[PDB]
Amino acid sequence: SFTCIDMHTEGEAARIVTSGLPHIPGSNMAEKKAYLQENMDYLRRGIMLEPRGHDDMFGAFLFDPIEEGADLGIVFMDTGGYLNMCGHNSIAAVTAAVETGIVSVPAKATNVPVVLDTPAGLVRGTAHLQSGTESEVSNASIINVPSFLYQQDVVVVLPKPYGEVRVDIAFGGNFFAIVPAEQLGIDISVQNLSRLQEAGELLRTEINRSVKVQHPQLPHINTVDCVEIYGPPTNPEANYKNVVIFGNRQADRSPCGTGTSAKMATLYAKGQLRIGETFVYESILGSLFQGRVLGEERIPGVKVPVTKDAEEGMLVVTAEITGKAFIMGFNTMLFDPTDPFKNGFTLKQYIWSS
Amino acid sequence: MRFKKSFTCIDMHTEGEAARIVTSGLPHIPGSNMAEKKAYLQENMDYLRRGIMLEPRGHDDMFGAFLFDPIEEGADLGIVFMDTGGYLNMCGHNSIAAVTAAVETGIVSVPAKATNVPVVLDTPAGLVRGTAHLQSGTESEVSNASIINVPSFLYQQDVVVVLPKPYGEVRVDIAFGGNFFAIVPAEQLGIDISVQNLSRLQEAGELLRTEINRSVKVQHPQLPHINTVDCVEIYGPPTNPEANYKNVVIFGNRQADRSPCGTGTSAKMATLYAKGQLRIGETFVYESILGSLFQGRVLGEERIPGVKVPVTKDAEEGMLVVTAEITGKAFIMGFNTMLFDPTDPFKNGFTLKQY
Ligand SMILES: *CC(=O)C[C@H](*)C(=O)O
Ligand SMILES: *CC(=O)C[C@H](*)C(=O)O
Numbered sequence: 001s002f003t004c005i006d007m008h009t010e011g012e013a014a015r016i017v018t019s020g021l022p023h024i025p026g027s028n029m030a031e032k033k034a035y036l037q038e039n040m041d042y043l044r045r046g047i048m049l050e051p052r053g054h055d056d057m058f059g060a061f062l063f064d065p066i067e068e069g070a071d072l073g074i075v076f077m078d079t080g081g082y083l084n085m086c087g088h089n090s091i092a093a094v095t096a097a098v099e100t101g102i103v104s105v106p107a108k109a110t111n112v113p114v115v116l117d118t119p120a121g122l123v124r125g126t127a128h129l130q131s132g133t134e135s136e137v138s139n140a141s142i143i144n145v146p147s148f149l150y151q152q153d154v155v156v157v158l159p160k161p162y163g164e165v166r167v168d169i170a171f172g173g174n175f176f177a178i179v180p181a182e183q184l185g186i187d188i189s190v191q192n193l194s195r196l197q198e199a200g201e202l203l204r205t206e207i208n209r210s211v212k213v214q215h216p217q218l219p220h221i222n223t224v225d226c227v228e229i230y231g232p233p234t235n236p237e238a239n240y241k242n243v244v245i246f247g248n249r250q251a252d253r254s255p256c257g258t259g260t261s262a263k264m265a266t267l268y269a270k271g272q273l274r275i276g277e278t279f280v281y282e283s284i285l286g287s288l289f290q291g292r293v294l295g296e297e298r299i300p301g302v303k304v305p306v307t308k309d310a311e312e313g314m315l316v317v318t319a320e321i322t323g324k325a326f327i328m329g330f331n332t333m334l335f336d337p338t339d340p341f342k343n344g345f346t347l348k349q350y351i352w353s354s
Numbered sequence: 355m356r357f358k359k360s361f362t363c364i365d366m367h368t369e370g371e372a373a374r375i376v377t378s379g380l381p382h383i384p385g386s387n388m389a390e391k392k393a394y395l396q397e398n399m400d401y402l403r404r405g406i407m408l409e410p411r412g413h414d415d416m417f418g419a420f421l422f423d424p425i426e427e428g429a430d431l432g433i434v435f436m437d438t439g440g441y442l443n444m445c446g447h448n449s450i451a452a453v454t455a456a457v458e459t460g461i462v463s464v465p466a467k468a469t470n471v472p473v474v475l476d477t478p479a480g481l482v483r484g485t486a487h488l489q490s491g492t493e494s495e496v497s498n499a500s501i502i503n504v505p506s507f508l509y510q511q512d513v514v515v516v517l518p519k520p521y522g523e524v525r526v527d528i529a530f531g532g533n534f535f536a537i538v539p540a541e542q543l544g545i546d547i548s549v550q551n552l553s554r555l556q557e558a559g560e561l562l563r564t565e566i567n568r569s570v571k572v573q574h575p576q577l578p579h580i581n582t583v584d585c586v587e588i589y590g591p592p593t594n595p596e597a598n599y600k601n602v603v604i605f606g607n608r609q610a611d612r613s614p615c616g617t618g619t620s621a622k623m624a625t626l627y628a629k630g631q632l633r634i635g636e637t638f639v640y641e642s643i644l645g646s647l648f649q650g651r652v653l654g655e656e657r658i659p660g661v662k663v664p665v666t667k668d669a670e671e672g673m674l675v676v677t678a679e680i681t682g683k684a685f686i687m688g689f690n691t692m693l694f695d696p697t698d699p700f701k702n703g704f705t706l707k708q709y
Pocket of ligand 2: 605
């Protein structure tokens with residue numbers, strides 16, 4: 001049996017496994033993720049998939065922190081595999097840590113830091129407390145790992161009825177292909193969600209076939225794992241609306257924190273967003289996240305495709321993302337060794353271009 | 355405060371199909387029988403079903419039930435079933451799960467040295483007599499569970515239903531197995547029962563259910579409150595050698611059963627029995643889209659003089675009903691305390707499924 005704190009962040013699940021896991025080696029969180037992925041993938045499958053989960057479930061395993069200064073180690077998972085970072089799950093974990101007492105709250109504290117050691121690096125979170133409560137969280141922010149536009153105006157050819165599209169590749173904790181919905185000929189709407197999933201899958205697969213990406217500081221991150229499809233906002237408070245397609249072409253119900261970070265890095269690189277300016281991203285559900293670019297930095301002697309010959313070094317930015325998570329369940333998940341679906345199942349069919 | 359309005363559940367599944375069995379958290383629900391309590395919930399507290407069944411706490415193919423104290427004489431537990439669209443009068447897989455959960459979690463006592471434990475369910479469709487078959491050696495580990503369903507019957511035969519393209523005109527049987535079913539060969543819809551075709555099967559099932567309920571009036575002759583076709587059973591040749599046929603049942607907000615569906619199996623057996631194709635005691639094995647198997651036997655038959663349904667011939671002496679036993683295996687998959695913060699925008703759930 002495993003104990004879980006089932007959270008959701010504005011409609012998007014985050015199943016946070018807090019106890020009962022087998023002991024896992026690894027000298028950092030990236031190696032722990034690799035160990036799970038390579039040797040114990042049955043854990044993910046049983047916890048994420050039907051019948052205990054479903055095709056759009058998401059979650060994370062907690063571990064002791066390893067990187068200096070962190071409160072919790074975390075490895076994220078979904079219906080397909082393992083993302084190096086997740087903003088909505090980070091917001092959920094920061095929230096759960098404070099509300100359930102995994103991390104202590106100083107006396108008279110109105111903000112409580114919760115630092116996550118993730119496969120993509122250190123993620124500095126803050127739970128913003130409800131005034132007059134000891135540990136009720138109003139919302140939570142996360143300062144993401146450095147983000148960056150990687151490659152601009154990448155042209156890929158998808159099968160009909162999509163054909164040729166142009167995207168940006170950016171890192172926000174995961175590598176994203178960021179594309180306007182208009183180029184796909186699909187409005188972002190609940191009605192089009194299945195098509196959005198198919199386009200996202202086709203675009204992700206085609207991008208990884210034709211562009212080889214590599215995070216220049218983190219060897220293990222060498223694929224594009226997420227497709228961010230954006231368009232005009234519905235809520236007048238939002239700058240844009242988006243849906244991210246990832247995992248086994250599941251869709252984020254949240255605006256997606258890493259995807260927002262990647263979008264903000266891209267806008268910033270193009271001069272379209274100032275440091276400290278509030279950016280508001282809306283989801284397919286109408287949910288909002290707020291983000292701000294906190295700073296920028298050039299890394300001398302390190303280039304990505306977008307980095308100019310004249311430029312000694314790549315531009316990165318540090319972005320903060322804010323959202324609200326709720327506890328939806330305290331769960332003890334059970335696995336009878338004679339249960340034929342102890343490792344879950346899906347009825348979703350795979351798709352691929354011919 | 356945090357646990358205000360929470361619910362405790364035993365999350366079960368029966369060969370892949372969820373049964374979220376709510377064990378505490380409801381206030382008193384007015385009603386002098388289970389059918390009335392079901393109507394109360396549906397009319398006055400439907401947001402509870404939606405919050406428990408739907409994302410983010412559930413999903414588009416979740417299923418479950420509320421437990422109550424039994425009202426009907428001889429029953430161990432009251433139960434009201436729920437899904438992503440509404441409330442079925444009976445559910446085979448959830449009854450199998452409830453019998454199993456009752457024994458394994460000690461809701462019912464296991465008599466000294468027993469190998470089989472009866473668990474009787476008071477449902478909106480009537481009394482359902484369950485038996486938990488214990489694993490030899492163990493005190494209360496359940497190997498599988500059988501349920502003797504409420505009376506089942508073929509109701510109306512060769513009903514022509516006209517659906518939009520690419521389906522057009524189809525021929526179905528209507529039969530009662532605890533719910534009314536329209537039973538239809540997948541062949542007639544132009545599609546195979548396969549995971550590939552699941553979305554289409556859901557669409558076809560929903561179309562068929564809507565059209566049937568407009569164009570055909572059904573009425574259970576002994577239970578006034580049952581007067582709609584709630585489920586569509588789409589069947590085809592088996593994949594597993596052990597199975598007679600395969601099916602998928604579409605119901606709720608066009609969700610699909612991952613189990614072979616016990617009420618659908620009961621309706622199918624009553625149909626086969628009526629056509630002389632199954633004898634009393636003969637094992638019928640039904641396969642699901644997942645490859646799961648349920649076993650059924652017809653245990654008894656009765657003609658009810660003076661009571662007819664559309665298939666009852668003038669040559670005949672009252673409508674035929676059968677008593678069907680269904681057997682499957684359920685597992686505990688979790689113990690959950692579900693939370694509903696009043697400021698949570700999705701306290702009542704959501705679905706992204708089309709229209
Ligand atoms: C982990 C994801 O689902 C991508 C969106 C996010 O919140 O980072
Ligand atoms: C309750 C349902 O899902 C219909 C199938 C069955 O097991 O009776």
